[PDB]
Design a protein that fits this description.
Layout: H1 6-21, H2 34-49, H3 68-83, H4 90-98, H5 114-117
Helix pairs in contact: 2-3
Amino acid sequence: TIPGNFAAYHELWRNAFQEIMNDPRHQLHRNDVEYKKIHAIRTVLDDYTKGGNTWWAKFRRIFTFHWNRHHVKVVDDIVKEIDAGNYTTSRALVDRLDNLAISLGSKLNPKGTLKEQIGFI
């Protein structure tokens, strides 16, 4: 099935991402130092923003979806946040990923409202 909004694309992405990070080829353990976890996640996210050829081939279908372009832009900003040293635990990094599709407020009226604000129109 085809995700019909950005949050639905992100849910599919989340399911992929956890499958990828749980791959035994990462050789990560719960008691690994946090830097090692963050770096493995960074690697996988970077691969995602470059077309997904190393870690995301099984999910190649998601790169054709409409939402991919903007989702890749957001994940690219997160990779930059990693590079800038914003994450000291992998737990915080995955909370960021978890919640990247939500936002505060609600849709702005893209149209002007002059005709609504004049009573007789």
